[PDB]
């Protein structure tokens, strides 16, 4: 679809069998979701931005459905202020900015 | 133009005669630029990032030119590591997310 930006570009995602809302965040290198239990081994990592860093659990090669489009990639889980879909998955679903 | 997300969506912007590199960021409610000494009055504000909040100065009705389109509105200024064009100005230039 084509999404305007008068409101936050929030979409429904499906990960680990759960439905959630996530923000399409072109300013995010990576995808960071709120605390949740996902199958498989995870590695401790830290990611930073405005304000500093937070500790996250890195899950690799995770299936995630974003607004009906499938992606398989790295998902970071931790105390993020909002669920954000970053460029690592936006690229997989063919997302671009246009004006 | 069409901006793919393989790399950070950085573009040249023009503000008050100066050229800067800035992120086209659908995850940012409001435009925020790196520290700069603007004239005029402002309102204190706090913005929430991945690592917590920082304090910024809010300026109103600031003109920024983005790839031939002129946008005017709220421009925050603070100790950010990158210049960010947020939704408040992206909407004015007709910017959409497409996949
Ligand atoms: C809605 C919550 C997000 C944080 C999640 C808000 N951010 C915009 C976001 O695009 C930010 C913009 C940003 C880009 C680069 C450095 C600092 C901030 N990117 C970001 O934090 O991404 C992190 C996750 O992937 C990694 O790649 C970038 C940092 C990591 S922000 O920078 O803190 C921001 C908050 C409020 C306004 N008005 C303008 C910007």
Question: What is this structure's SSE topology?
Answer:
The structure is a homodimer of 99-residue chains.
Chain A: E1 2-3, E2 10-15, E3 18-24, E4 32-33, E5 43-49, E6 52-66, E7 69-77, E8 84-85, H1 87-90, E9 96-98
Parallel strand pairs in A: 3-8, 4-7
Antiparallel strand pairs in A: 2-3, 2-6, 5-6, 6-7
Bound molecules: ligand A60.
Main sheet: strands, sense, barrel of chain A: 7 strands, mixed
Indicate the proportion of strand residues of chain A: over 45%
Bound molecules: the ligand CCC(CC)CN(C[C@@H](O)[C@H](Cc1ccccc1)NC(=O)O[C@H]1CO[C@H]2OCC[C@H]21)S(=O)(=O)c1ccc(N)cc1
Q: Domains counted in the coordinates of chain A: how many?
A: 1
Going by helix content, strand content and strand pairing, the class of chain A is mainly beta
CATH architecture of chain A: Beta Barrel
Q: SSE order of chain A, as H and E? A: EEEEEEEEHE
CATH homologous superfamily identity of chain A: Acid Proteases
What characteristic shape of chain A results from the CA principal axes?
A: globular
Number of strand segments of chain A: 9
Largest protein interface?
Answer: A-B, 39 and 38 residues
- In CATH, the topology of chain A is named Cathepsin D, subunit A, domain 1
- The level 1 CATH classification of chain A is Mainly Beta
| Quaternary organization | homodimer
Structural Rg of chain A = 13 Å
The helicity of chain A comes to under 10%
Spatial gap, N to C terminus of chain A: 15 Å
**Number of helix segments of chain A?**
1
């Amino acid at each position: 679809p084509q999404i305007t930006l008068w409101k936050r570009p929030l979409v429904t995602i499906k990960i680990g069998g759960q439905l959630k809302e996530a923000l399409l965040d072109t300013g995010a290198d990576d995808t960071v979701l709120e605390e949740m239990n996902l199958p498989g081994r995870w590695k401790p990592k830290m990611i930073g931005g405005v304000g500093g860093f937070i500790k996250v659990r890195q899950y690799d090669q995770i299936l995630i459905e974003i607004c009906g489009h499938k992606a398989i990639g790295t998902v970071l889980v931790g105390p993020t202020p909002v669920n954000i879909i970053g460029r690592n998955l936006l690229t997989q679903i063919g997302c671009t900015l246009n004006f």
